[PDB]
Symmetry: D2
Subunit: 144 residues, 4 copies
Amino acid sequence: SGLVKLGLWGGNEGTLQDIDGHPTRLTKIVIRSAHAIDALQFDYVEDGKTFAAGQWGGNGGKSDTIEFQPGEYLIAIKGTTGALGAVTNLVRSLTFISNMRTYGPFGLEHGTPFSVPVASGRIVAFYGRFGSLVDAFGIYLMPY
Amino acid sequence: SGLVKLGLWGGNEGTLQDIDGHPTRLTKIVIRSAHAIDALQFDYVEDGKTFAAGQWGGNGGKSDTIEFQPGEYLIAIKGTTGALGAVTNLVRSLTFISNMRTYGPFGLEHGTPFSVPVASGRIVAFYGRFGSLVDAFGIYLMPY
Amino acid sequence: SGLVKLGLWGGNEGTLQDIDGHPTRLTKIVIRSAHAIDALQFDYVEDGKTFAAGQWGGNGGKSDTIEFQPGEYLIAIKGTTGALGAVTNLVRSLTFISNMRTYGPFGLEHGTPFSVPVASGRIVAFYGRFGSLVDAFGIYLMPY
Amino acid sequence: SGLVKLGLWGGNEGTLQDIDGHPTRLTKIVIRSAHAIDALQFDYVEDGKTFAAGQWGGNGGKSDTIEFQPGEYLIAIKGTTGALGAVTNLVRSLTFISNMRTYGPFGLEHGTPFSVPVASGRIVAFYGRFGSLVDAFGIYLMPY
Ligand SMILES: OC[C@H]1O[C@H](O)[C@@H](O)[C@@H](O)[C@@H]1O
Ligand SMILES: OC[C@H]1O[C@H](O)[C@@H](O)[C@@H](O)[C@@H]1O
Ligand SMILES: OC[C@H]1O[C@H](O)[C@@H](O)[C@@H](O)[C@@H]1O
Ligand SMILES: OC[C@H]1O[C@H](O)[C@@H](O)[C@@H](O)[C@@H]1O
Ligand SMILES: OC[C@H]1O[C@H](O)[C@@H](O)[C@@H](O)[C@@H]1O
Ligand SMILES: OC[C@H]1O[C@H](O)[C@@H](O)[C@@H](O)[C@@H]1O
Ligand SMILES: OC[C@H]1O[C@H](O)[C@@H](O)[C@@H](O)[C@@H]1O
Ligand SMILES: OC[C@H]1O[C@H](O)[C@@H](O)[C@@H](O)[C@@H]1O
């Protein structure tokens, strides 16, 4: 693997979903959100071929697409976790900050904050726990 | 060099302090704290030799020592940042969770939280910004 | 920076040439050769952008181009070192073996052999020593 | 794992033997040898605890022990593979070069040479194929 794997942020419900590969570049994120984060889908590169992970989560909210340009990469992720309805603890919001611009916040910023500023490294993939929504979230990082 | 470097959590004052080496094992932390985190000092192993980083920060508060046992390693770090006195934003508290027990809280766990749960990897060193207190804090992780 | 760097195979003359980047994928090699290896040039990907390293070496011999397909990567490299003309020790031949086919031999496979079979990892870049020919050769590998 | 794994050098007989761990430091090698390399055993450090790998191979030849000092690490390995008796291809000799001294050659230098000079990295463990002798040999390297 040889990735640093951070997580999980969020609760214990839903079902664990994870990659089966060796990503070296994150190229695309499709995120569904509204009052919380509904679903995650992302594309990564491995040995020059592009693979799609997800979609993980439900079909609620509205969709937003992040297509990273060549030379663009994530330098930080922020979010919040907390209650919604009957769910004790899930991912309420996510913000993706690249070296060129900020994407988000997606969802609504309620609950306990978290933040992952990256001084040296590359974010290449994600994992989490998912049901009809994103119960929990985690990150794969590669040394730079 | 092949480490993922996360940070900084906290403010922009004090002075940057950082390691000059290639750590593969964190063996000891000495932390001074009271209402905030006053100072950090830690030992790491490189090529079988033990090196001391720090002390970074002042001589206020009280001292606590964490000596990791063989087979003991950090699985998560928590903290809070915020104002103290005349300082706009510094590290108010830190908690270190190993696979055997929890160390802390050091400081006071009020203010804005951050958290770094490690699903796969090893925390091997730290860096930050320091004056008479710990202005900012960061972490080095190795893939596992 | 988080790469394993193997080398050098060959002699001590010519001039050191090396990359200035963080490669994650080798996409192309252009090699000039005849009785020895005359020059090396290769393309790699970093943050989704393609960068060209080299050409290192002279304009003798004949050119061959290796363009790796998506999903194609090197699993082994072979070569030989030895004398040519007035040069005490240089790279006489190189063979590049991918998971799909074998490229070469380039040069002449006489002299002292070396071999780098990769059980787990990825070859992402090269370096060496160069004058009018390839005096010496080395390899960058990434954990897989 | 997050190690670069090189190999195998040697033949296809014997039985594959390999580590079940995440070594970060090689501390000791015990090698049995005579006309070829008979067996390998080595100690490594993981999360500050010492683990013994092997012994792999038979009980022939004579034993030699390499105990690395703090601050001592391997910078290169050399060897030869080839026939002995009824064995078509096995490991005939090995030499271990540290930043302080050279250990070996062990065995007898017959057959096809190989060499692994390390410009950047650390050798932390080995694997191979083994019967009554060392049929084949491989190396684990960590980025530095
Ligand atoms: O964000 C959670 C939830 O928010 C809103 O109620 C709707 O858009 C749903 O489709 C969505 O699942
Ligand atoms: O995603 C929110 C919610 O989705 C579904 O209802 C179930 O899988 C729950 O376990 C989960 O908490
Ligand atoms: O921790 C910051 C600061 O907190 C309080 O003001 C006192 O207890 C000091 O000893 C300490 O330096
Ligand atoms: O550490 C708290 C404080 O210490 C010193 O007074 C200076 O370095 C300041 O810049 C810093 O904010
Ligand atoms: O390859 C080294 C050298 O080999 C021969 O001398 C010739 O074919 C040259 O074209 C070439 O430069
Ligand atoms: O490359 C072969 C030869 O090329 C040039 O003449 C010089 O750089 C030499 O040092 C080198 O040995
Ligand atoms: O080295 C292979 C072989 O060499 C010699 O014949 C003896 O020392 C044996 O014990 C050993 O197995
Ligand atoms: O190690 C040399 C030899 O040992 C044993 O005889 C068997 O396991 C063989 O397969 C192997 O080739």
